[PDB]
Amino acid sequence: SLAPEDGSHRPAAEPTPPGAQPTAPGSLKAPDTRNEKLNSLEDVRKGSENYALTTNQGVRIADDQNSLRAGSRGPTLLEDFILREKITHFDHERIPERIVNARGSAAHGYFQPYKSLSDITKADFLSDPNKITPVFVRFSTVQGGAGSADTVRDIRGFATKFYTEEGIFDLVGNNTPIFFIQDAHKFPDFVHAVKPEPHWAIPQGQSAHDTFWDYVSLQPETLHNVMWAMSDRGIPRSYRTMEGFGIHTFRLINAEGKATFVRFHWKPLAGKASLVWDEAQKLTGRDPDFHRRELWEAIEAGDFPEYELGFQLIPEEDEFKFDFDLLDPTKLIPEELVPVQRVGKMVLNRNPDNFFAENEQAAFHPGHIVPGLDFTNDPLLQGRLYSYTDTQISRLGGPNFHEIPINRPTCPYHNFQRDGMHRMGIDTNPANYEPNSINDNWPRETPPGPKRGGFESYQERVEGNKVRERSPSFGEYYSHPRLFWLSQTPFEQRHIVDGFSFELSKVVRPYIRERVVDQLAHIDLTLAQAVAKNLGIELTDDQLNITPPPDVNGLKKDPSLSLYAIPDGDVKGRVVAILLNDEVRSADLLAILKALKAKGVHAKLLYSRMGEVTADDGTVLPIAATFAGAPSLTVDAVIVPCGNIADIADNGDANYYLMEAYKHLKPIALAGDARKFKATIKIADQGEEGIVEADSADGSFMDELLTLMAAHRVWSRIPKIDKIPA
Amino acid sequence: SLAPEDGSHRPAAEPTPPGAQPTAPGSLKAPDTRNEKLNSLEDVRKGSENYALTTNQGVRIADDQNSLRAGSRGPTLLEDFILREKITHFDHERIPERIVNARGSAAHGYFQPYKSLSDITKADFLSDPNKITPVFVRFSTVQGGAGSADTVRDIRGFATKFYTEEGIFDLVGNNTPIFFIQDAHKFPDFVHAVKPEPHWAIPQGQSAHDTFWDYVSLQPETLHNVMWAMSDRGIPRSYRTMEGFGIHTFRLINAEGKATFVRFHWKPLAGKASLVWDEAQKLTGRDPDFHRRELWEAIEAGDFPEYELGFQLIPEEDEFKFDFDLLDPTKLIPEELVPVQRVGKMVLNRNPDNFFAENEQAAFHPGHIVPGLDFTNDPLLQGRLYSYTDTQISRLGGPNFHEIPINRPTCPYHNFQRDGMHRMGIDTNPANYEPNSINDNWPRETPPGPKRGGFESYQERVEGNKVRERSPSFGEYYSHPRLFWLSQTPFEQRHIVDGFSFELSKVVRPYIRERVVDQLAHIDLTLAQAVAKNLGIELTDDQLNITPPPDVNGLKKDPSLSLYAIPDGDVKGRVVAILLNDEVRSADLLAILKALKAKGVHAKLLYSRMGEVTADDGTVLPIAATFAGAPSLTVDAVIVPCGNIADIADNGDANYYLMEAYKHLKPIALAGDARKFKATIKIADQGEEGIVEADSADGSFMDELLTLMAAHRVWSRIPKIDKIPA
Ligand code: HEM
Ligand code: HEM
């Protein structure tokens, strides 16, 4: 029952490209990657090699293949304590998944600021460019269960736990800069509406159903984040290629006591990139684990996800200077009005060891702040402060969830709290209360001050009556949707129109569709008309005369709201499919791989069967996957080298592979006789931008391909794809 | 007054076809469909129309849109108890999902036996053909989470709770007649191997990964159920079109105390029908809820799932008369050797009201037997008896899960058990122990007898030493795999080969694929060579010389092991896509739609946009979905009527619709100018079997199409689908 002779069961503990080795727990793949938090988990890491198999009480097991029975065909005996312990632990494996964001993928890394921020905040983790803060990040979808698919259309969660020297700070954000609703009291309404409908629990991972669009049509506050969801923001290529936002306005407090309003941003250093809808939806079927896999593999390859932290900063005296309320989380602050100041860089550089222990049990909370940070009255933030504490007690089984290893602070913690289910800490303090004399009052309160001080809330002025009332300043719902719409490129606008049209086609009750279209007519007539036409709906004269909402503080657009208007492409860590034949021209392949390797782009070698093929020069080429097994959905570009093209010329899967990649706007490159495939994608002989072609794969061919890949997708091909049957 | 004035928000309370009306809770869709269990749930059903919104304490709420704050832009106040109750209930909505079979879809129904089985069992529910037993049935996949996809390749669970007059009997079976392992002590091993891998929690809903095939390769007892899983059995078309089996040998006990060995069968009255792999995998992307949806809609349409319960019965004296052990759950009993005796009929005729409350909380247990039934020493069954009790106490929150409405017996239950979390029953008995005099010893024990007697175990002789030892009678692993293989049609054998080949290609460590292939060579050389060829592996001369395993009691095949070898087609409840154009020939459509209606086959009218088109004669045709919105994966056949074909002839989606349906072996029917689509699928001029074509949709056009549909798929097409890039 043993390992192969050749040690091929065990992956190399060295960075390797996706597919080259079986993936492995982080501490075994990258044992020399350390930080303070990863080190501190060492008390609970358990190995296995050379150890005897035992019960949980330490008793060695002789026979782990059989129950104890009276004779070998007899009844199982109740005294089999080994069987019952093993079955009981199995029987009790599951815990409640998260009520939202149950589907998520996490990794370890570190953060450091570029320069001390002491002028605007006394937060210790921002005080020194050479003081490094361990982090654990979990990225997530929102709607679906923990076993749902990665590449659904949904908002994404982006939660970062900072293990600072002055306490855990969790920054619990999303990949769009606003939320659907204004006041936390409506959260259960909204989430019930987007989640599977309660009679039949359908659909998973999708807003494309009646109840979501019903709530939307009756709650126009939702429309801004709905625009972002229906755009390609809702289908990121990778967690590495999306933006992050805290959404709410928070405060920074400096040593002088000055408060500055702040909104938090993460910039992906790999650039912004999203799938297209047909590709994203098909990919939930071909690989429901695509984003989880891609994140794990990037870290195993050395393509560490990196993000830049950035702050939009607004002085206290400028609180009311915009035509939107800063405390309204359905409103974004355009970068054109308030730029993002770069603050520091976060690098995710190691995977967990056990997904359940570290990812499933991690607990983040936006209420987890530190001195130098504070809240505001944002009525959605205010309610979140209550919710995460409450849900985690039942999800994680009691109030000692901070003792679960992943959640533990790395800085000191001491207090008079005691007991609770699964209490780990054995307190020796003779006192469990303060004030006490019997322990000289330790642990003691600490006055606030410039560093290492106790937490004190900023003394904000509160004046008003106890009311359940939405601020009048929050009652404007169309101008930000329209700013977003106007800031998208034409192809991005088309994909938005296609998102609304596809989703509303799945709404069974037609008046719900009509009411949503009426809401679109309040944002932009061109958008409303394009959706209406796809739905066979005709706008009335009144609808055509709805006056468009005002510009946002004179802005007619802000290109930072577009994924693509401003190029920010980075090809490192992207992947190319190379479609092999049984007599590959080894000169083509040499040049291809050399150029890819120079830019940090990975390759997957594909064929019509598994095993190996032999190139013209005797080189044996191992096959990663079949054309069916690793579809074009899972790669960024396709390259077909010369060789014996007749081997694959009439293979349906190989032809379809090119048709699918072509449809989904990916760069394709064809060398030598592979150019015969130009017929399948049915498109000229002078060639076309987006298809690289040459007698062979030279320097120039690869440079062209690599340039297209830096632009992510071939948008100019869009008019050509409605004709292809794929 | 948010409801539309025309009342179109509310589905009609009468049977309607899939897509015609919004779906609804069962008691609102079908209020007149009643049984004793459904009636008994009336005490906990809660309505809503005309009632005030309240807290859970009954306090009316005035403003469910806002939190209580100090000023309309101020902080939220801790005194907002309305907000806190609503968010707390929300925060605590989730419970742990089931450890296996977390993904499942359920319905209410009723069972009746065909005749009294008093001669072989004193079970009350089988005593009288006029005795109706309410049932609740849940069908499930096994590996994936509750939010994973339906049409994965997996075993399916088929669990039936019989609410009998002498106790709940749960028949907790699968859709194949054997299990992967022999002894319950290995269940955590096997389940851990198939489930997502522990470092990264990948893959969901798939056995296509290293750990599963590592375990299979080291445990040849698994091979028989592995053959079933790799066959089209692993991908059923519908829960309505798969077989059910209790797997284990149990006993029936009659009034005279005679024991008869029994294995339980469910026969689907709708026939056996499965998907093909590329279809199944893509459908997990296009509609991960396809089986759940299909079940619910069948019941809403009146296409009630019906199954015939059947027994294979073996006299006690015949225990040792087979080449295989009756207590070995990796062995099936061939129907050629022991026929299934028809026992009664089960009809599922009403959906749940609330999925969580009825489906998610339902608890089934194979240990829930009734007098007239008993267990055997099958060492897998023996361990199951321990596990379900134990898991349900954590899953459902305590020992009073039998008081959760869906789980309650409809017969009396009284005993001395008290307390426990969530105790609903208020016991008035002065006594909580027996024997007692202070309540005259009530409730009292009941002697066993012919009817209404207490449970007494059959007095089976036990003789042996206490051993953890597998019976040598269980040590044979290849003959049942071979009998299965040899019983499959040539196309089924091909789909088995492709299943192994596809799955093994995703195993990253090659030696593992090699080891599986070796195991295949012990089953059947043709099978092993064909998988080997697809994996680029050459068998050794030793491998080529392995002698096949013996026949199973002289049988070299049993056709009842095939899905298709014996026609059992049933078209009622199936569905056809009809591809519209903007001037449909209304005569073809009247004939098409009435032909389908007469046989109970549903239609979905499809186009390039939503809304309406107008037929040649002015008939308005309402559009159900777009070509991309409702892909050929979701239908059984496709019909293209004549009209203005030019409207859709260049539509890539409309052409691809036919390609996809063609590839997946579905019947396609083309009327008049729709025959121009023959070129998209490469159909010869003189036609081919599996494509119905005529000048018009009259005469025998619809009969021929319906004949194809009764045979499910056009298997003869398999060699043709190899070209076609789809
Ligand atoms: C700006 C709007 C919000 C954002 C950006 C957001 C973000 C997130 C994220 C990223 C997670 C997952 C953390 C993880 O990976 O474990 C999460 C979980 C959760 N959120 Fe929020 N959220 C928002 C609004 C709300 C509201 C209004 C409430 C309720 C008042 C709420 C309650 C919850 C709950 C109960 C969890 C599960 C936490 C756990 O089980 O540990 N969220 N949220
Ligand atoms: C012939 C073999 C088996 C069959 C046919 C089978 C069938 C099933 C089915 C259909 C379910 C889902 C019931 C539902 O819909 O809620 C289930 C659940 C479950 N099974 Fe089995 N099973 C088998 C073997 C085992 C074994 C050997 C064990 C452990 C010793 C086991 C432990 C469990 C557990 C813990 C659950 C979850 C039950 C709950 O949470 O209510 N099963 N089984």
- Token output for A618: 């005797």
Query: How many Cβ atoms are within 10 Å of A500's Cβ, its own excluded?
Result: 26
Report DSSP state, residue B142: S
Question: Quick one: how far is CA B500 from the chain centroid?
Answer: 22
Residue of A nearest to B538 (CA): A611
Size of chain A in residues: 726
| CA dist., res. A100 & res. B451, Å (int) | 51
Report DSSP state, residue B450: S
Q: Which helix (DSSP H) or strand (DSSP E) does residue A663 occupy?
A: helix A652-663
Query: How many Cβ atoms are within 10 Å of A677's Cβ, its own excluded?
Result: 24
Number of helices followed by number of strands (H, E) in chain A:
18, 20
Rounded to a whole number, what is the distance in angstroms from the first to the last CA of chain B?
49
Q: Is A274 helix (H, G, I), strand (E, B) or coil?
A: strand
Closest CA to A319 of A473, A174, A181: A473
Cβ contact (<8 Å) for A188 and B89?
yes
Phi, psi of A138 (to 5 degrees): -125, 125
Nearest protein Cα to ligand 1, atom 2? A179
Query: How many Cβ atoms are within 10 Å of A32's Cβ, its own excluded?
Result: 5
Ligand 1 pocket, residue A363 CB under 6 Å = yes
| CA dist., res. A278 & res. A162, Å (int) | 37
A316: CA distance to ligand 1 center in Å?
A: 27
**Torsion (CA) A637, A642, A646, A652 in degrees, nearest 10:** 0
| CA dist., res. B114 & res. B120, Å (int) | 14
Question: Quick one: how far is CA B335 from the chain centroid?
Answer: 22
DSSP letters, A230-271, are: HSGGGSBS-GGGS-EE--S-EEEE-TT--EEEEEEEEEETT-
Closest CA to A563 of A335, A348, A241: A241
Best mutation site among B95, B97, B99, B101 for ligand 2 pocket (most ligand atoms within 8 Å of CB): B101
Cβ contact (<8 Å) for A466 and B625?
no
For chain A, state the CA radius of gyration. Answer: 28
β partners of residue B158: B139, B173
Mark residue B661 as left, alpha or beta (left: phi above 0; alpha: psi -120 to 50; beta: remaining): alpha
Q: Is A112 helix (H, G, I), strand (E, B) or coil?
A: strand
The residues near B207 (Cβ < 8 Å, ≥ 6 apart) are B143, B153, B154, B194, B213, B229, B503
Question: Considering every ligand atom, which ligand is closest to the CA of A170?
Answer: 1
Best mutation site among A101, A291, A406 for ligand 1 pocket (most ligand atoms within 8 Å of CB): A101
| CA dist., res. B597 & res. B602, Å (int) | 7
Ligand 2 pocket, residue B138 CB under 6 Å = yes
CB pairs below 8 Å between A and B: how many?
Answer: 451
How close does chain B come to A485, measured CA to CA in Å?
23
The residues near B682 (Cβ < 8 Å, ≥ 6 apart) are B720, B723, B724
Instruction: Using CB atoms within 10 Å of the CB of residue A398, give its burial: 0 to 12 exposed, 13 to 18 middle, 19+ buried.
Output: middle
Closest CA to B721 of B652, B655, B657, B666: B666
Is the sign of the CA dihedral B696, B702, B707, B713 positive or negative? positive
B80: CA distance to ligand 1 center in Å?
A: 20
Question: Quick one: how far is CA A172 from the chain centroid?
Answer: 12
- Spell out the alpha helix ranges (H) of A290-406: 290-301, 379-395
Lookup result for tokens 């007054």: B1
Identify whether the C-beta of residue B84 lies closer than 8 Å to the C-beta of residue A187.
no
Phi, psi of A287 (to 5 degrees): -155, 85
Mark residue B553 as left, alpha or beta (left: phi above 0; alpha: psi -120 to 50; beta: remaining): left
Cβ contact (<8 Å) for A511 and B4?
yes
Q: Using a CB-CB distance cutoff of 8 angstroms, which residues of chain A are in contact with residue B723? A: 650, 652
Instruction: Using CB atoms within 10 Å of the CB of residue B198, give its burial: 0 to 12 exposed, 13 to 18 middle, 19+ buried.
Output: middle
Ligand 1 pocket, residue A384 CB under 6 Å = yes
Which three-class secondary structure string do you get for A400-459?
CHHHCHHHCCCCCCCCCCCCCCCCCCCCCCCCCCCCCCCCCCCCCCCCCCCCCCCCCCCC
Q: How far is residue A649 from each of residues A643, A646, A659, measured CA to CA in Å?
A: 11, 5, 13
Experimental method: X-ray
**Torsion (CA) A58, A64, A70, A76 in degrees, nearest 10:** 90
Which of A87, A327, A625 comes nearest B73 by C-beta?
A: A327
Cα atoms in the Cβ-side hemisphere of radius 13 Å centred on A666: 26
Phi, psi of B409 (to 5 degrees): -60, 150
DSSP letters, B673-690, are: GGGGGHHHHT--TT--TT
Question: Considering every ligand atom, which ligand is closest to the CA of A146?
Answer: 1
Residue of B nearest to A626 (CA): B505
- Token output for B253: 């006990």
How close does chain B come to A530, measured CA to CA in Å?
12
Structural resolution in Å: 1.9
Lookup result for tokens 């005593």: B127
Crossing angle of helices B81-91 and A187-194, rounded to 10°? 30
How close does chain A come to B94, measured CA to CA in Å?
5
Could you give all domains of chain A from N- to C-terminal order, each with its CATH number? 24-409 (2.40.180.10), 469-572 (1.20.1370.20), 573-726 (3.40.50.880)
Lookup result for tokens 């303060």: A434
Mutate to test the interface with B, among A468, A508, A515, A638 (most CBs of B within 10 A): A468
β partners of residue A170: A161
Question: Considering every ligand atom, which ligand is closest to the CA of A93?
Answer: 2
Identify whether the C-beta of residue B573 lies closer than 8 Å to the C-beta of residue B597.
no
Question: Quick one: how far is CA B372 from the chain centroid?
Answer: 28
The residues near A52 (Cβ < 8 Å, ≥ 6 apart) are A60, A61
The residues near B440 (Cβ < 8 Å, ≥ 6 apart) are none
Instruction: Using CB atoms within 10 Å of the CB of residue B431, give its burial: 0 to 12 exposed, 13 to 18 middle, 19+ buried.
Output: middle
| CA dist., res. B159 & res. B246, Å (int) | 9
Lookup result for tokens 């003779």: A430
How close does chain B come to A362, measured CA to CA in Å?
14
Identify whether the C-beta of residue A638 lies closer than 8 Å to the C-beta of residue A632.
yes
Question: Quick one: how far is CA A689 from the chain centroid?
Answer: 32
Question: Quick one: how far is CA B629 from the chain centroid?
Answer: 25
DSSP letters, B413-442, are: ---S----TT-------S-SSSS-STTTT-
Phi, psi of B147 (to 5 degrees): -105, 20
| CA dist., res. A70 & res. A59, Å (int) | 22
Ligand 2 pocket, residue B171 CB under 6 Å = no
Q: Is B541 helix (H, G, I), strand (E, B) or coil?
A: helix
Question: Quick one: how far is CA B419 from the chain centroid?
Answer: 36
Q: Which helix (DSSP H) or strand (DSSP E) does residue A486 occupy?
A: helix A479-486
Closest CA to A675 of A693, A661, A689, A691: A693
Crossing angle of helices B187-194 and A81-91, rounded to 10°? 30
Mark residue A651 as left, alpha or beta (left: phi above 0; alpha: psi -120 to 50; beta: remaining): beta
Nearest protein Cα to ligand 1, atom 42? A384
The residues near A428 (Cβ < 8 Å, ≥ 6 apart) are none
Report DSSP state, residue A95: -
| CA dist., res. A702 & res. A688, Å (int) | 16
Identify whether the C-beta of residue B615 lies closer than 8 Å to the C-beta of residue B592.
no
Identify whether the C-beta of residue B327 lies closer than 8 Å to the C-beta of residue B377.
yes
Ligand 2 pocket, residue B562 CB under 6 Å = no
